């Protein structure tokens, strides 16, 4: 009745909310095309919905496509549309896109996620590359094959999880792509609104499901803890008591169908006013959007002194933002170290550095690209013989329009260098410090966001949520780990990009050497800068 | 199907979106029974749905009540239960609870609004104590009644309005009182939840309605601009173009069944996993949730300095807070006046008062009292006649545990005395700052809440809530009229309850001094306290 006459493409449609999420759609009265990695599991779940809920077969179509190779997506979506060989009828057109699909990526602390496929242990199969792929990239796939061929009206929904949002011990390599793929739904819903698509995102808390029991019986065994404590945080967090199987209202987790019900509704005419909106799946969690403040000041760095501290600058390109940085924190008598992805950038340094009294001398420049984590590694090494350890470090992007009219190598790009990259920087980091203890004085890091482009930031938006749910965790781990056997991280992102005044860069500077040269730590991870700074 | 068997209230069922909510509900297969003040428009809408639309005259049973008085909504809810003169079938228990009744309050500018009978001119109908009980109060009054009789797994369903969080000109009487019922409604989730009822909000934008026409008529004519302007600022806002009566993908608004069909949602057990939950009907409007930012340093006072500033400190009973207030001014040299709604207070102040070398007076004591607005604005003359002006207020809760379990004039207490008392507070203030112009230099407001309660600062939270968007309206309005005919009010509020150490009042006290006697002014509207402040 509801989605009657309906065509939808659910990815991950025989995983096991995929499975209800399908089955739901199908009695509602939609064509339902499922795809999957498995062949085969799709094959049988077809099977399984014709011979035992008597569905008709025109009504299901199993198509096999990795969603992480855009290839293989643009493939199948002409497949459905004009017939093919796996599509035995012309669909002509996609209704409702359920964007389901996503790994579990590598279960892991971030000192061992794996960034080469030779890292990958047993219980894992995913590097951090191929996580963030079937995370964030294969929604950002799909939504860019899929848009051209759905008609005004149209519903495209992602599913995402509320632990995009909250500690997630072990899993950054899951949860930070997943809050990536937050900040591009909302991204996506500006774009295709003016064309009549709505765009939503549902965030599923813990779903009685083999996967949750599994997920939660490894993050048990990475933080040490007994069986069932990963559970019971989440279950006190719950506002909503709720019937279970034998009538006790009592705190339990949703049902897979609870989350297929949410997509029936989104994928129906009924929500029709309805983009760019959140459906929380959690029975009332209290997790925030955001966590973030303003800089309502400007820092005197009159009393600010880090004579000793090693301050490392890790930058893409960015010669003149990475120069500026150095500048300040050397007034600050800090021992600066800036790190190049670049060598480019790196030579353009050079020059430019060679252009009261102190007595602190010019920041050492060298190569540092985290996407070769090997050569990464040594030159921490080597810095911290020369230098005697890395006290602090800033993080600028990995380098400095539309999100659906894009050339794919743009997007493939993006995800490897800022993505991954970041991600993997903080890994290299974060395992140099576990490996070179220098006392229990907390190292601090900072990212730092691009200014302003001038053209509504939505890559840098993305960017951001992915780095606020990296810093999240990896406060907890180091924290947790720093008394659970080593020195705890704090870590905050700086925003610049909200604010488009000449005054940016060296407002940014002060807070930047004010934060890593004092005893001053703030509590929320996003720090933005004002709308207007005098 | 969706509601089969289910008993349902509706406040205003007869309304513009009411009558559409009603009949989807009927559709769906509940008992609706619908409320109002006017017994003969619910008379004839039930007439309208038997004999027109083939309902079966049991489910449909009209209820006059006006729901801001709790007397009558308990004698109506045990009617419904019970049976009664107006309820021929006892109905016995409340499934779903569609708080949606809620007047239009007076349309008037902050300067203007009715505070007494007497003041309420022809276009409008309420004071704003009326305002505030047929919009928070007449929720409150209801969830309180039907809770008892509403078994696990229910659903209390509250329409507030996306324009408790926006600019809205010359109706803080209905938006201040609407941010007020959102946070109710997050408390009433947080209680409620234990016993499996789930609470939810719908946020309608603009509703395709005689209401948002007339609304938007009397908006623009009070800003003085042309026919269609609010609608076309809004209109603009929308991120979701939408097929229109002529099939063109424009911005338009939504409909009145788009918000039925969300409350059927909410009222269906498709949405058992949902509480605590926004719904925003509005095309995907990008409206915050708050306006907020976190102290993350103490400032300095030695800079500070407010010489032949007027600052007028509100207070109900808070004599040690307003003469530590005072204190901290008057070290910063200016001239004080502490005003107490309670007269014991301003004894006690008196002995307490009388208790760097600093030329500056002792704080002159007043009894203010906003909910004798005759006596305020003479004692604000008489304050004009003896010091020359009035720059800048300081502005404390009219008075220093359960939403649920609360005598009756508790509820009222907290409702006249905080919404009431403060919002007419406001208006005297606006009043007496337009009839006395004093210069182009803005004057500050700063509404500073309550120290923590140790309960979880329930009632606090919903006075956060209605002076936030108060805030918001009247910088909006005040610099509106400020530029078309007078100075601009500049106003925050400081939360103070999220932090419970030693050191919060002067912490507090120091920015107060400091957003006050210096040039600093922050655009967020709330202003944190840290958790930690060293
Ligand atoms: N408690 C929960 O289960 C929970 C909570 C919050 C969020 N979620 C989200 O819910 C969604 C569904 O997961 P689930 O609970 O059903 O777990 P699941 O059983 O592991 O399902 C994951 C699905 O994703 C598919 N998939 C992964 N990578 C793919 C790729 N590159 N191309 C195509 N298909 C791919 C898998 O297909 P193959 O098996 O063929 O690879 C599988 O069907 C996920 O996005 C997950 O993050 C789950
Ligand atoms: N564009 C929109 O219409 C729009 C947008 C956002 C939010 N909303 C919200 O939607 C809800 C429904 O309003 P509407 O659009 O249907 O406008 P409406 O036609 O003015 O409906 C308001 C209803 O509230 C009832 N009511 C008011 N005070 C009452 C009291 N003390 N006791 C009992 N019933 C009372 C009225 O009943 P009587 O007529 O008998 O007094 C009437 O049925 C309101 O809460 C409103 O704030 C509306």
């Known amino acids: ?154 519903s495209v929904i992602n599913i995402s999880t509320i632990f995009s949002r909250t500690d997630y011990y072990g899993r950054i390599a899951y949860v930070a792509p997943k809050a990536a793929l937050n900040a591009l739904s909302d991204g996506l819903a500006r774009e295709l609104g003016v064309r009549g698509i709505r765009v939503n995102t549902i965030y599923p808390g813990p779903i009685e499901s083999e996967r949750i029991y599994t997920m939660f019986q490894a993050m048990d065994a990475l933080k040490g803890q007994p069986e069932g404590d990963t559970a019971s945080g989440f279950l006190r967090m719950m506002r909503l008591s709720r019937i279970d199987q034998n009538g006790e209202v009592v705190k339990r987790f949703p049902s897979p169908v609870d989350v297929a019900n949410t997509a029936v509704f989104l994928a129906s005419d009924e929500s029709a006013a309805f983009t760019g909106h959140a459906f929380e799946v959690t029975h009332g969690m209290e997790v925030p959007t955001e966590s973030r403040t303003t800089f309502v000041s400007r820092p005197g760095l009159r009393s600010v002194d880090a004579t000793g501290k090693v301050i490392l600058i890790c930058a893409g390109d960015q010669v003149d933002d990475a120069v500026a940085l150095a500048d300040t924190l050397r007034s600050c008598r800090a021992t600066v170290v800036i790190g190049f992805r670049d060598p480019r950038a790196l030579e353009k340094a050079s020059v430019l550095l060679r252009e009261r009294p102190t007595m602190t001398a010019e920041a050492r420049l060298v190569r540092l690209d985290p996407l070769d984590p090997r050569a990464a590694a040594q030159t921490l090494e080597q810095i911290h013989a020369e230098l005697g350890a890395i006290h602090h470090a800033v993080v600028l992007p990995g380098q400095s329009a539309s999100l659906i009219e894009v050339d794919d190598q743009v997007v493939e790009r993006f995800l490897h260098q800022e993505l991954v990259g970041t991600i993997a920087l903080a890994r290299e980091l974060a395992r140099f410090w576990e490996e070179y203890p220098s006392g229990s004085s907390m190292h601090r890091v900072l990212f730092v966001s691009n200014p302003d482009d001038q053209q509504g930031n939505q890559y840098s938006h993305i960017l951001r949520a992915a780095v606020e749910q990296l810093v999240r965790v990896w406060r907890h781990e180091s924290e947790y780990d720093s008394v659970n056997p080593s020195a705890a991280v704090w870590a905050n992102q700086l925003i610049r990009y909200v604010n488009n005044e000449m005054a940016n860069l060296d407002f940014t500077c002060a807070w930047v050497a004010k934060l890593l040269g004092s005893d001053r730590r703030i509590a929320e991870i996003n720090l933005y800068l004002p709308e207007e700074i005098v």
Chains 1, 2 share one sequence.
């Open 1 to 154: 009745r509801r989605l009657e006459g309906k065509v939808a493409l659910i990815t991950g449609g025989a995983g096991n909310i995929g499975e209800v999420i399908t089955r739901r759609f199908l009695a509602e009265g939609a064509t339902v095309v499922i795809t999957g990695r498995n062949a085969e599991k799709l094959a049988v779940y077809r099977r399984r919905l014709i011979d035992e809920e008597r569905v008709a077969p025109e009504r299901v179509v199993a198509l096999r496509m990795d969603g992480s190779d855009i290839a293989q997506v643009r493939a199948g979506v002409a497949q459905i549309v004009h017939g093919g060989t796996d599509v035995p009828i012309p669909l002509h057109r996609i209704d409702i896109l359920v964007n389901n699909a996503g790994s579990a990526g590598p279960r892991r602390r971030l000192v061992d996620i794996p960034l080469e496929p030779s890292e990958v242990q047993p219980p894992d199969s995913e590097t951090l590359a191929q996580a963030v792929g079937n995370l964030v990239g294969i929604t950002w796939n799909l939504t860019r094959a899929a848009a051209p061929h759905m008609p005004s009206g149209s």
